[PDB]
Amino acid sequence: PVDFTGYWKMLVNENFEEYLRALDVNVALRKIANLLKPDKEIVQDGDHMIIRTLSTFRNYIMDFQVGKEFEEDLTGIDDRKCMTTVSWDGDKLQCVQKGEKEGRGWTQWIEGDELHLEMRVEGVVCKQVFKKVQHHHHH
């Protein structure tokens, strides 16, 4: 069984500017966000999953029950809210974010020491890869 618990450091962030543009993030804020290399701190506790995206600019925290649709507040990302469901798809974790934007969601999986995160909106695809790490720092 797949367990995402751990601390993960960003290695690559591919096509993030177009993903942000598709979310209508303003130009000045895209400049800031494109420089960020956030960590992921994940705790999988039964079906309760916490995914913290940690950066020097701000943190974005997801805290949900797998399988249960919830109102996700993305105010700090693109000023939207979505009805979001995160579910298992075999060994992958799928997120569908229903809202104003078509085809918004993400897929997360592990390969070896890598956390893979593919983020999608309106036919744009952004791919991030993080490496599992062990030196922890307070947040």
Ligand X SMILES: COc1ccc(S(=O)(=O)N2CCC(O)(CO)CC2)c2c1CCCC2
Annotated binding site for all-trans-retinol: 40, 62, 108
For the bound state, the minimum distance from the C-beta of residue 90 to ligand X, rounded and expressed in Å, comes to: 20
Q: Give the chain's count of helices (H) and strands (E).
A: 3, 10
Q: Which residues are annotated as a binding site?
A: 40, 62, 108
What DSSP assignment string belongs to 36-91?
---EEEEEEETTEEEEEEE-SS--EEEEEETT--EEEEEHHHHSEEEEEEEEEETT
Asked whether position 38 contacts ligand X by CB under 6 A, the answer is yes
Which three-class secondary structure state does DSSP give residue 100? coil
For the bound state, the minimum distance from the C-beta of residue 91 to ligand X, rounded and expressed in Å, comes to: 20
From residue 18 to residue 37, the character string flagging contacts with ligand X as x (rule: CB under 6 A) and all else as - is -------x---x---x--x-
For the bound state, the minimum distance from the C-beta of residue 100 to ligand X, rounded and expressed in Å, comes to: 14
For CA atoms 50, 15, 106, 114, the dihedral sign is: negative
The two beta strands, 70-74 and 92-98, are unpaired
From residue 107 to residue 126, the character string flagging contacts with ligand X as x (rule: CB under 6 A) and all else as - is ------------x-------
Pick the closer one to ligand X by CB: 7 or 38. Answer: 38
For the bound state, the minimum distance from the C-beta of residue 109 to ligand X, rounded and expressed in Å, comes to: 15
